[PDB]
Ligand binder design. Structure first.
Ligand SMILES: COC(=O)[C@H](Cc1cnc[nH]1)NC(=O)CN(CC(=O)O)Cc1ccccc1
Ligand SMILES: COC(=O)[C@H](Cc1cnc[nH]1)NC(=O)CN(CC(=O)O)Cc1ccccc1
Ligand SMILES: [Zn+2]
Length: 956
């Protein structure tokens, strides 16, 4: 009945709360495809995944398949304009991206729902006749090198590659994924390689249709999506490439029983423990890896972490199966170490083996599997609806692993109980497979080897057999017990009926001196979850730097205490967030509403009758010290972003202020602080989800009552509710702050043009300008000028004030990035004058679609409202108000605004810049305007003292 379509799959099993409609099918050419029909989606999306990635790079050009990924975007035969694709999305409310794993390259985009076809068509071309333009290839190789450069100094990446580089060197596993300027131009030049050819070769070899999965999601009928996909994608070449496999492990027991001593960049202290295991993927229906993962990783009473944490040796632990490739995986157990811990490593690893030994002696436990099976089934049934980009991307990957029908459920549902497999994998977690890496500053000087790509310093040893034998004889250890029934598993999921007096936006259903309660019963998502947000205002949480440190430490200590208890709930999909703000504290409780008042009570109770364990205090303080220090190792752009926040906020305590005031925090002094901070508060809360007005009031009152009883809390005076103001920069003024980043050899810059207060009109002016320049900023500063990998434009908003910001991390100097951005601003004024009246309306419509996307999941609606509430703006209808107004703006309005606030010689141009310089300093392109001469900020206080502050914004 149809020659283009091999199979039509069946009734892809979905959660019965999922209203979206699905069809899977194999094409003639072998492409696996899922089609998602959602007649209500605001954005359509699609994704393609090719089962080939950087493991299939040729040896002589590292990171080629990653680089090829970068180039599919920059031009194809049918749509040859360098940024046809980029621009097409921008103009139609879309966004796009790609990643490359060892074994996949994965491409996704989303677009306004009615331009799915336009978007999708420009997209199919990536896989049919791309161009790899000679001029692009040349330019874009720099993007890759920046991306690598960004990664060079960050520990996560260094360890990641140092693993690869200590396995069998002949194994594809050992390769360098990212690539750089050296590997992809400098060197293929030296060895006479035409790269455009080499890209064409690879794309031709491997981007074969039998290695591809597609997901398309749109408002269209399933039958409509079907036709569309067949049209755009039947034309893909089947080169019948055999799928690569790696049946032989890269860790070969020439490589087992090794210890590695590693020098970190940040001052961190972890121990990595790895075991090579076979590929468990096929066992997905029983999932032994998860089971042993669930147990070893456990954090409850009688768990492994519990003991290590109790001898003060470790703080956090992570265990479980680790993805490798077709043919191999790892099983890992990783901990961070205390100072004491770093000296009892041998011991810690022994404790790990005692726990494994316990699991062997107890045997595999069906009741535990039954629990995992039940949590997973509940998780699946009541899973939140996904944003379409993530969703298509995600399924496109897993289409390569599961029958069409199982794609939605395969990652969730458990079916087979498999003692044998559990017992089999358990047999591999033995000292004679073990690999140990310790990462610590204490190995500086003491290392003797260097990893070539990132420059990592390490020493390598055999583990002395004394020590292996010593681990092999792991006794049972009475302090280790399996978890007991998880009491927190939800049993009640009944959706309460929508009330007689329910409203579309959160209602102010309580306004005492103690508390302001915002509430809305869920009229949208119908899952048995709720979101409970509380802002606790106390002025002592930021009164000074020392107090700030205590507010923090207090909160960490508390979290640390409850960890054992709450982890049970985390697994039952009930979780909490608790950190300190400049305003006081913040507390979220998210998840299956069923046992939710219970966790809340246990938190507030613990919070208000807290007892501090000295040894916990000691450790967490040392951790926080390192933590503050380690800011000096963060990326140049975060540095620049931070300094700006420091420059434009009425009050803010610097990292050095905090760390110097931190040696001053004794155990007795914190013990005073807590009862003190809790003594007067005000509380604003949003309660949102499957709960009733009375359930809500009860919860709010219950919180208050617990503080009143146990901490004697009373109300703050309304006038103590200081919110903080933004600094107000003069007309035609330009200030520069300058610092150096000591770790990173990129530099960074933020430029901020301050405009005015937030207001329906000023808001849209900035937003619309932001939109029109969004994609050209990126296309000019990265694609053409290749100034860096990190290139960001868009609105900035703080303390009620707003403006335009640019962020760039780059090889070239800040004063230079300044000129190219200011140059760019003129290019924009020109092309706004030049751009068609319909071209202009696209951007309006585009920003409108963007602004109007309905939240898909409950906690995404919550976020929007909490936005309004913590900002004291309380404009729950902003999206409608503000769109209405946007639709009535003209080319003329936006030019005035630009010539008013933004242009180089603007009447009211307020401009500050942060230049963060790299470790080491002190044409084809358009006309940069000559700039004023800046006022170089030398002192953050002398700076803020001498300028007006802005008014805080008006409510309602
Ligand atoms: C939830 O059940 C688990 O399997 C454990 C639990 C755990 C919680 N805290 C420490 N362990 N989680 C994990 O093992 C995390 N995994 C898998 C994952 O994140 O999907 C291991 C992992 C994570 C990152 C990088 C390599 C392995
Ligand atoms: C600084 O700019 C970016 O964030 C870019 C790409 C982008 C394209 N259009 C808007 N932004 N990078 C990423 O998002 C990073 N990806 C990798 C890549 O694009 O090469 C990281 C990543 C890693 C694992 C899973 C998903 C994404
Ligand atoms: Zn990349």
């Amino acid at each position: 009945n149809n020659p283009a379509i091999k199979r039509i799959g069946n009734h892809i099993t979905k959660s019965p709360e999922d209203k979206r409609e699905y069809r899977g099918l194999e094409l003639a050419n072998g492409i696996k495809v899922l089609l998602i029909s959602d007649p209500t989606t605001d954005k359509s999306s699609a994704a393609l995944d090719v089962h080939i990635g950087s493991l299939s790079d040729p040896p002589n050009i590292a990171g080629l398949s990653h680089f090829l990924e970068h180039m599919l975007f920059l031009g194809t035969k049918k749509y040859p304009k360098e940024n046809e694709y980029s621009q097409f999305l921008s103009e139609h409310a879309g966004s796009s991206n790609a990643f490359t794993s060892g074994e996949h390259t994965n491409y996704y985009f989303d677009v306004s729902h009615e331009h799915l076809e336009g978007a999708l068509d420009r997209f199919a071309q990536f896989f049919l006749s791309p161009l790899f333009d000679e001029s692009a290839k040349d330019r874009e190789v720099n993007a890759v090198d920046s991306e690598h450069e960004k990664n060079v100094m960050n520990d996560a990446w260094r360890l990641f590659q140092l693993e690869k580089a200590t396995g069998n060197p002949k194994h594809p596993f050992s390769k360098f994924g990212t690539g750089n300027k050296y590997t992809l131009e400098t060197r293929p030049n030296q060895e006479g390689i035409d790269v455009r050819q080499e890209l064409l070769k690879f794309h031709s070899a491997y981007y074969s249709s039998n290695l591809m999965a597609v997901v398309v999601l749109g408002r269209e009928s399933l039958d409509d999506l079907t036709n569309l996909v067949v049209k755009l994608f039947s034309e893909v070449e089947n080169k019948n490439v055999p799928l690569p496999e790696f049946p032989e492990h890269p860790f070969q027991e020439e490589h087992l029983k090794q210890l590695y001593k590693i020098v970190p960049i940040k001052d961190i202290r972890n121990l990595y423990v790895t075991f090579p295991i076979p590929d468990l993927q096929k066992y997905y229906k029983s999932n032994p890896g998860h089971y042993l993962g669930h147990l070893i990783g456990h954090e409850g009473p009688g768990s492994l972490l519990s003991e290590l944490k109790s001898k003060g040796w470790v703080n956090t632990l992570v265990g479980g199966q680790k993805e490798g490739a077709r043919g191999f995986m790892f099983f890992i157990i990783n901990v961070d170490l205390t100072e004491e811990g770093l000296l009892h490593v041998e011991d810690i690893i022994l404790h790990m083996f005692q726990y494994i030994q316990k699991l062997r002696a107890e045997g595999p436990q069906e009741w535990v599997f039954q629990e995992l099976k039940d949590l997973n089934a509940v998780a699946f049934r009541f899973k939140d609806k996904e944003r379409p980009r993530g969703y298509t991307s995600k399924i496109a990957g897993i289409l390569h692993y599961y029958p069409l029908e199982e794609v939605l459920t395969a990652e969730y549902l458990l079916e087979e109980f498999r003692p044998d497999l559990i017992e089999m994998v358990l047999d591999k977690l033995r000292p004679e497979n073990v690999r140990v890496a310790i990462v610590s500053k204490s190995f500086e000087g003491k290392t003797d080897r260097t990893e070539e790509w990132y420059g990592t310093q390490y020493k390598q040893e055999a583990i002395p057999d004394e020590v292996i034998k010593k681990w092999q004889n792991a006794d049972l250890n009475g302090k280790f017990k399996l978890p007991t029934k998880n009491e927190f598993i939800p049993t009640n999921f009944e959706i309460l009926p929508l009330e007689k007096e329910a409203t579309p936006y959160p209602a102010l259903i309580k306004d005492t001196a103690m508390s302001k309660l915002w509430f809305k019963q869920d009229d949208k998502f119908f899952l048995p979850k709720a979101n409970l947000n509380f802002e606790f205002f106390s002025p002592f949480a930021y009164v000074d730097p020392l107090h700030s440190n205590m507010a923090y430490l207090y909160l960490e200590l508390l979290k640390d205490s409850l960890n054992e208890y709450a982890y049970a709930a985390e697994l039952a999909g009930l979780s909490y967030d608790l950190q300190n703000t400049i305003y006081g504290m913040y507390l979220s409780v998210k998840g299956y509403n069923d046992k939710q008042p219970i966790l809340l009570k246990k938190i507030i109770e613990k919070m208000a009758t807290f007892e501090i364990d000295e040894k916990r205090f000691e450790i967490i303080k040392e951790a926080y010290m390192r933590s503050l220090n380690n800011f000096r190792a963060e990326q140049p752009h975060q540095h620049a972003m931070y300094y700006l926040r420091l420059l434009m906020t009425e009050v803010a305590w610097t990292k050095d202020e905090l760390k110097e005031a931190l040696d001053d925090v004794t155990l007795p002094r914190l013990k005073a602080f807590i009862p003190q901070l809790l003594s007067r508060l005000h509380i604003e809360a949003l309660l949102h989800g499957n709960i009733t007005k009375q359930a809500a009031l009860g919860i709010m009152q219950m919180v208050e009552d617990t503080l009143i009883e146990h901490a004697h809390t009373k109300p703050l005076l309304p006038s103590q509710l200081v919110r903080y103001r933004e600094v107000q920069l003069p007309d035609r003024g330009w200030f520069v702050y300058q610092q150096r980043n000591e770790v990173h050899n990129n530099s960074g810059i933020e430029i901020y043009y301050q405009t005015d207060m937030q207001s329906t009109s000023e808001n849209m002016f900035l937003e619309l300008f932001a939109q029109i320049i969004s994609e050209p900023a990126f296309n000019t500063l990265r694609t053409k000028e290749q100034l860096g990998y990190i290139v960001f434009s868009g609105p900035r908003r703080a303390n009620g004030i707003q403006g335009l910001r640019f962020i760039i991390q780059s090889e070239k100097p800040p004063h230079y990035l300044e000129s190219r951005v200011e140059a760019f601003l003129i290019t924009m004024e020109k092309s706004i004058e030049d751009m068609t009246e319909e071209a202009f309306q696209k951007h309006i419509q585009a920003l409108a679609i963007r602004r109007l996307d309905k939240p898909k999941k409950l906690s995404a609606e919550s976020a929007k409202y909490w936005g309004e509430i913590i900002s004291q703006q309380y404009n729950f209808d902003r999206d409608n108000t503000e769109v209405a107004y946007l639709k009535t703006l003209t080319k003329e309005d936006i030019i005035k605004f630009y010539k008013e606030m933004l242009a180089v010689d603007a009447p009211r141009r307020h401009k500050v810049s942060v230049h963060v310089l790299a470790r080491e300093m002190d044409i084809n392109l358009s006309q940069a305007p000559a700039l004023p001469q800046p006022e170089v900020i030398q002192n953050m206080t002398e700076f803020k003292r001498g300028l007006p502050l802005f008014p805080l914004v008006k409510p309602h």
